[PDB]
Amino acid sequence: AKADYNKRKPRKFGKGARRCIRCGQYGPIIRIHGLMLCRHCFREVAPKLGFRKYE
């Protein structure tokens, strides 16, 4: 089968189990209260997600 040599594996833990919902990278991903984004994308989309910086 030529569909058995370009197909991945279903991980369920470890850095390779989750990827950013908008960029697509593994690594530093935010998992607080559910949203799943980079540390880089959350910083330039937050003020539209509702957040604000008070201090």
Partner: protein, 197 residues
């Protein structure tokens, strides 16, 4: 709990908006809003060209609904387009207008003065543009144009002014455009008057 509800239904809008930006790149997609009622939702898109967004008599919105319901949430959608609230006081439309004008072939100085004259005509207090790329050379540069009062730091220059950013791909490279417009009702704290007798 309840926070997991609030910040799960705030992300869907982010994704929908960030996709429709690309898709309706032209016709100047202005922004949207979701009204969630029983038995289904209802989407609104303030385009700048109802013709192009609708399609050829309704042969595009079908694809928009199927795509917006199969890849996204929004189990029962109903789209309809509208016309912009104030296209000359919304920075994130002027940014794309100037970016388009640039990548069509105009020189970068005619575009900026056209835009600033139009904006300060339709009744703004102050505007500021800033272009920076590989224009006229092989070492990059940066230029600035402005007209009047415009606050830059503090709290008032975070909620009153309107700012937007865009790109403009070309044959050499990219060019960034960044606008910032002040609505005609500024009312900074310093503007104290005397209600007289």
């Amino acid at each position: 709990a309840i926070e997991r509800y609030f910040i799960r239904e705030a992300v869907k809008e982010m994704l929908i908006d960030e996709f429709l930006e690309k898709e309706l790149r032209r016709a100047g997609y202005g922004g949207l809003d979701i009204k969630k009622t029983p038995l289904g939702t209802k989407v609104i898109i303030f385009a700048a060209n109802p013709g192009y967004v609708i399609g050829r008599g309704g042969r595009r919105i079908r694809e928009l609904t199927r795509i917006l319901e199969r890849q996204f949430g929004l189990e029962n959608p109903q789209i309809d387009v509208q016309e912009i609230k104030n296209p000359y006081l919304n920075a994130k439309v002027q940014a794309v207008r100037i970016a388009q004008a640039l990548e069509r072939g105009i020189h970068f100085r005619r575009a900026a003065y056209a835009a600033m004259r139009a904006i300060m005509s339709n009744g703004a207090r102050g505007v500021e543009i800033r272009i920076s790329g590989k224009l006229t050379g092989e070492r990059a540069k940066s230029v600035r144009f402005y007209q009047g009062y415009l606050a830059k730091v503090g709290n008032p220059a975070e909620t009153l002014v309107s700012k937007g950013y865009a790109q403009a791909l070309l044959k050499l490279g990219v060019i960034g455009v960044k606008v910032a417009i002040m609505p005609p009702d500024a009312r900074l704290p310093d503007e104290i008057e005397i209600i007289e007798k």
